[PDB]
Amino acid sequence: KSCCRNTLARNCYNACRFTGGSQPTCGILCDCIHVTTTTCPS
Numbered sequence: 001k002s003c004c005r006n007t008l009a010r011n012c013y014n015a016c017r018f019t020g021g022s023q024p025t026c027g028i029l030c031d032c033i034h035v036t037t038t039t040c041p042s
């Protein structure tokens with residue numbers, strides 16, 4: 001349920017997940033967060 005600060009960080013996150021990274025890992029490595037709601041903070 002991912003949320004990233006910009007598109008460079010977004011690509012970071014998707015590639016991280018695809019090559020085996022857990023949610024918390026990918027959030028840490030790509031400066032992203034996970035929410036239980038339908039939208040992210042600006």
Ligand SMILES: [Cl-]
Nearest residue numbers: 021022023024
């Ligand atoms: Cl996970």
Ligand SMILES: [Cl-]
Nearest residue numbers: 020021022025
């Ligand atoms: Cl991991």
Ligand SMILES: [Cl-]
Nearest residue numbers: 023024027034
């Ligand atoms: Cl997280």
Ligand code: NA
Nearest residue numbers: 017020021022
């Ligand atoms: Na993964």
Ligand code: NA
Nearest residue numbers: 022023024025
């Ligand atoms: Na984990």
Ligand code: NA
Nearest residue numbers: 022024025028
């Ligand atoms: Na982790």
